[PDB]
Amino acid sequence: MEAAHSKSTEECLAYFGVSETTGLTPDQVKRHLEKYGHNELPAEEGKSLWELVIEQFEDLLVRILLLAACISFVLAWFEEGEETITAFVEPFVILLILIANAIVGVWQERNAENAIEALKEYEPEMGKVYRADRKSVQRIKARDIVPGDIVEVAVGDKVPADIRILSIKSTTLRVDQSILTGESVSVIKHTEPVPDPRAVNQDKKNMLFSGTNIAAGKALGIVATTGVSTEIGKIRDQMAATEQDKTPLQQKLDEFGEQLSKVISLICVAVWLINIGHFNDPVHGGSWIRGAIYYFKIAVALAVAAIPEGLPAVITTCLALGTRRMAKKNAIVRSLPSVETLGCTSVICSDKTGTLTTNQMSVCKMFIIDKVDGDFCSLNEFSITGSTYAPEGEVLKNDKPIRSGQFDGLVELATICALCNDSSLDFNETKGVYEKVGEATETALTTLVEKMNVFNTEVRNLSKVERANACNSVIRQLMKKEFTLEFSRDRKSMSVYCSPAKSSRAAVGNKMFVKGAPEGVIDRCNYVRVGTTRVPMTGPVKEKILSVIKEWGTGRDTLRCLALATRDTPPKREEMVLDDSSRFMEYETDLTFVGVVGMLDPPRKEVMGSIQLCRDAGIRVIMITGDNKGTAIAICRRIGIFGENEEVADRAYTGREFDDLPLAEQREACRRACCFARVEPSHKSKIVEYLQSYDEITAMTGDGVNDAPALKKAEIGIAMGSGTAVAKTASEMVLADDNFSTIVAAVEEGRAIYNNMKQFIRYLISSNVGEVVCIFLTAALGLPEALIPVQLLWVNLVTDGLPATALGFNPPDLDIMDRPPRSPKEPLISGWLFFRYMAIGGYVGAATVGAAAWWFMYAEDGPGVTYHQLTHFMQCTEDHPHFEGLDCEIFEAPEPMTMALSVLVTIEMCNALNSLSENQSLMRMPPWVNIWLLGSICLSMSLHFLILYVDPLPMIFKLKALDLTQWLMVLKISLPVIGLDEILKFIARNYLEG
Ligand SMILES: C/C=C/C/C(C)=C\[C@H]1C/C=C/C=C/C[C@H](C)/C=C(\C)[C@@H](OC)C/C=C/[C@@H](O[C@@H]2O[C@H](CO)[C@@H](O)[C@H](OC)[C@H]2O)CC(=O)O1
Ligand code: NA
Incomplete structure (x- = not known):
């Protein structure tokens, strides 16, 4: 079952013909195992011998x-x-x-070294299954597992095969798909089906891929595919x-x-x-x-x-x-x-985050509504100092330091950044500096709250460790974090249901604090915050909002804008279906716009010269990033891939755009393209093929298992030092400091x-x-x-x-x-x-x-x-x-x-x-x-x-x-x-x- 993610849990059981309570009968096990084969990657035979001497x-x-x-x-x-x-x-x-x-x-x-052998290190030795011959769970060899098996998984367990989740026994199920994605953020899975049949693995929120390991929780599911049919298996066959x-x-x-x-x-x-x-x-x-x-x-x-x-x-x-x-x-x-x-x-295809940038996310600017009145409208821009995760900085308006607490809009700004946030700061004594805990994006919001200090807490009296989560903890004293609606690429946002503490802080029941992509959040906002008061989302106001967001992203600042909104009158705790991930967007509606925060992922300190060094050396540099086309182009102009004022409409594409182009024009695009935004997983190897068609020595780079095929196919496969072993063994070169400059060097x-x-x-x-x-x-x-x-x-x-x-x-x-x-x-x-x-x-x-x-x-x-x-x-x-x-x-x-x-x-x-x-x-x-x-x-x-x-x-x-x-x-x-x-x-x- 390759499209098990799109099928319902009842349908997957019906296909294989297995009872969720009993499991596969030993007769079926013989049939399925003899049909689909053993759950294991083929032993890389055809090795060297005396023939190697011949x-x-x-x-x-x-x-x-x-x-x-x-x-x-x-x-x-x-x-x-x-x-x-x-x-x-x-x-x-x-x-x-x-x-x-x-x-x-x-x-x-x-x-x-061998790349396929390193890939076999992900498939576990044994796995848990429920067979009809017994009642209690019985662990067997992972290879003995076959499609249709009712498998069980818990925390710490390494996923044996591609599994369609049937029932989650724990409260929430988290999995670390670092090798099959890259983001170390343990994604949350669910039981409901994904309507898209050809959806990417990142969208399959009801599948447990082989090689992956459960970060937290416990669940039971049916095995969809095994062996070479798995996501790992399909990547293996590409390399082979x-x-x-x-x-x-x-x-x-x-x-x-x-x-x-x-x-x-x-x-x-x-x-x-x-x-x-x-x-x-x-x-x-x-x-x-x-x-x-x-x-x-x-x-x-x-x-x-x-x-x-x-x-x-x-x-x-x-x-x-x-x-x-x-x-x-x-x-x-x-x-x-x-x-x-x-x-x-002759060509160097590189990733933006980590290689071209420092990956030191920090909020630089932020604006809120000053006041609204008819056609007139004024915002309130600010600027934050200190490009680091450390709270050592300050907020200023028009190049002048101010108290963030004096603005009611900024008070809720810090509130949303503190609550709607799973990450946090942690001071390291050995290194001697503040380290991040979680995402770079969310940690920047945590750092921002520490810099603002909207409620004016003592700071000089605090220690170096207490300073880490001081202002963020003060926010958590006001509101209670009931539950959070997970992030998804369908709506591109995140919200958190919150209830006030027992102290009566003039709170209208319970609240929902939204955080996500600007265009997505602003559209779902029917209201606008103005310090304490509220007004309806008018046309002229919505223009100013998206205009400033457009200026920050397209401009020389090259900021990753993030709109922050709040739901004043959210649905009751009972009415909200907490399992349905699709209904999350509907729950995040009728919002009140609070403000936007713009953060920057600072380019490398030496990429300015390294890029220019390639210009003279006649080497073409192509950027691969996850940012939108507008900002991706702006970033390219900044580092040197593009000029400050030149035409680059056909010299840059998105994943959606490039995929829509015909096979001939795709090849025509690769000989002039210098920037690819929102790239699909398989697009890396495609670009290499088109580049190779012009007899051009390409240098693709990656870090995870997803990029292994692209690295293997590229002439000069480049991997990161912090990258996985499969990426290292598949690549021809490994960057020690994960720097684009060390490539050119x-x-x-x-x-x-x-x-x-x-x-x-x-x-x-x-x-x-x-x-x-x-x-x-x-x-x-x-x-x-x-x-x-x-x-x-x-x-x-x-x-x-x-x-x-x-x-x-x-x-x-x-x-x-x-x-x-x-x-x-x-x-x-x-x-x-x-x-x-x-x-x-x-x-x-x-x-x-x-x-x-x-x-x-x-x-x-x-x-x-x-x-x-x-x-x-x-x-x-x-x-x-x-x-x-x-x-x-x-x-x-x-x-x-x-x-x-x-x-x-x-x-x-x-x-x-x-x-x-x-x-x-x-x-x-x-x-x-x-x-x-x-x-x-x-x-x-x-x-x-x-x-x-x-x-x-x-x-x-x-x-x-x-x-x-x-x-x-x-x-x-x-x-x-x-x-x-x-x-x-x-x-x-x-x-x-x-
Ligand atoms: C070019 C970079 C190669 C890397 C490397 C680590 C080792 C290379 C260096 C290459 C030297 C070539 C010399 C040419 C000359 C006419 C042949 C002689 C003296 C030959 O003696 C008559 C010696 C050849 C020994 C090398 O043999 C390899 O045989 C393979 C099968 O035909 C070919 O695929 C390789 O092509 C590049 C070839 O190098 C041992 C070797 O690996 O040496
Ligand atoms: Na290669």
């Missing part, structure tokens, strides 16, 4: 690198040399990274169906992997096409097995050279170090990738990280491009091997990894918030940037190959050899006469490879300094700016010397120590890379920037 080896590059290990393992065993430990190193280190890199991607254990996309950066890296695979695959074919001349060679010239060793040992080098093996470790360390910066700036980021995509935030960090992140990405890729050119040059020309795959890995992992990680601490390029958001489909390298690192990669390739060729030919300690015979090193044993000087092992010498490797390492240290800034010259930007970079460079070169000195290492890397004689040549060939890059930077700023 997913890491699904891409193309990972298979190419894996293939490099298999081919390497084949060539590892096949060798004549009697070397032991160095045998299984090439295929060993590959698995080390392939395993390590896979573990990083599989790392979704500690860096990501919602698929989260991957950050635009992640899509670029997956895209780069596909491109890099074609590059490796193309070069492998290119290398084979260059050696197509071997077709025109004798079969007795040698063995094909010797040529196959070259083809296989080359391909493995290509895979290792092209791939940036250290990249994943570099970003994981950077983003982890970026997470700590987020936490310090009040921003608990969930996942690692979230810190980067945060900078690409985090977004600014997101762009700063992405700039530094994108920088070392081009740095590593630049090195990988050079390693491919080094291999292709030494292979195509037919030269001896310049670099070994075991060497290239240690270069990408350590020597390039350390500085690349140190590049994450690069100084933030100022004026970053001046530029617009990073485009989702923006390439990492393109145009001039591609040519820039292409030339840099092109030079290092020739430098490393030339460095090795230097030792083979024009060397000091090396042999005096020429180029034409150096390319024919594979024919050393064959063509004996042409090659004669020393052993053939000299072609496979460690010296020339040490030169090629030293030149590669030295240049990357210089290229790391080139990566300090993208275009800013090293003359402008000092190389010693980033201290962590210099520390990493010193550590890298220290490790470079380590693999040459400490004997155990160089034997494995196939290297031999170089003296000062050989190191000089390395610096001569390496250092020129800075000058070349300096020229490219100079060309970029001059003949490009325009």
